Design a protein around this ligand. Structure first.
Ligand SMILES: NS(=O)(=O)c1ccc(-c2cccc(C=O)c2)cc1
Ligand SMILES: [Zn+2]
Length: 257
């Protein structure tokens, strides 16, 4: 199946998912000097006060924290978005070393990791329907650099030993994703895609300019996860990022001057 290795990695995905070579693929390099400030972008609204986390899961490509999306509890609105988008899950992409791991890049700079908070447009009723629409999903992307620890990440890090291998999950209730956000909500936005198969062109990307800092100990715990299932040859879950794709006929807009 698809993965991040030499024989099943991003350069192979187009064979099973031809949209991999499409017109609005993600991630992209964000050229900060070419992105244009758009004074018409309304303010971004992150309303996570009523979030209900459910489970944490190793899916063989990342780990994810899942939320109750059966009501408007944790929602993203405003910015470039029309309507209301419910938080379904968050997950990360990271590297084998601190100089790579992010999917988006900024003036070709790679960060150590990237957090994706995945939301779907309630006008389509369920996420499966939303993935079939050009404005079905909104992903809030946040860069991670290594320095000081992020206290709001520690509860995640401390349960990873319980989901080491593909297929494992654990209860992960009462987690507050507000603890993963930087101070500023300044952002870049563009129309793109899922960065893992099926690579559907259904995402409004909102990438925050301000990274969060995490400690070396925190990212080291990400790197102890396994791509493999229990009993199979151990292959560390590292470098689970897709590289930047061609921008093609798109403009990246900035919310800030
Ligand atoms: N990495 S990312 O662009 O944030 C991302 C977010 C959500 C998905 C997703 C959504 C729904 C179904 C599936 C798999 O069938 C994948 C896939 C990729
Ligand atoms: Zn992702």
């Amino acid at each position: 199946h698809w993965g991040y290795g030499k024989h099943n990695g991003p350069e192979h995905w187009h064979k099973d998912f031809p949209i991999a070579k499409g017109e609005r693929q993600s991630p992209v390099d964000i050229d900060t000097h070419t992105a244009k400030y758009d004074p018409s972008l309304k303010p971004l609204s992150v309303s996570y006060d009523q979030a209900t986390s459910l489970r944490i899961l190793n899916n063989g490509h990342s780990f994810q924290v899942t939320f109750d999306d059966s009501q408007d509890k944790a929602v993203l609105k405003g910015g470039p978005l029309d309507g209301t988008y419910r938080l379904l899950q968050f997950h990360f992409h990271w590297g084998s070393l601190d100089g790579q791991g992010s999917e988006h890049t900024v003036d070709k700079k790679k960060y150590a990791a990237e957090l994706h908070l995945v939301h779907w447009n309630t006008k389509y009723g369920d996420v499966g329907k939303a993935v079939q629409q050009p404005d079905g999903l909104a992903v809030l992307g946040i860069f991670l650099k290594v320095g000081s620890a992020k206290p709001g990440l520690q509860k995640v890090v401390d349960v990873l030993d319980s989901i080491k291998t593909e297929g494992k999950s654990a209860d992960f209730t009462n987690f507050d994703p507000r603890g993963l956000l930087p101070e500023s909500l300044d952002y870049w936005t563009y129309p793109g895609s899922l960065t893992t198969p099926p690579l559907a062109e259904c995402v409004t990307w909102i990438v925050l300019k301000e990274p969060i800092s995490v400690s070396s100990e925190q990212v080291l715990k990400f790197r102890k996860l396994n791509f493999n299932g229990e009993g199979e040859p151990e292959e560390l879950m590292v470098d689970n990022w897709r590289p930047a794709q061609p921008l093609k006929n798109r403009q990246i807009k900035a919310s800030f001057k």
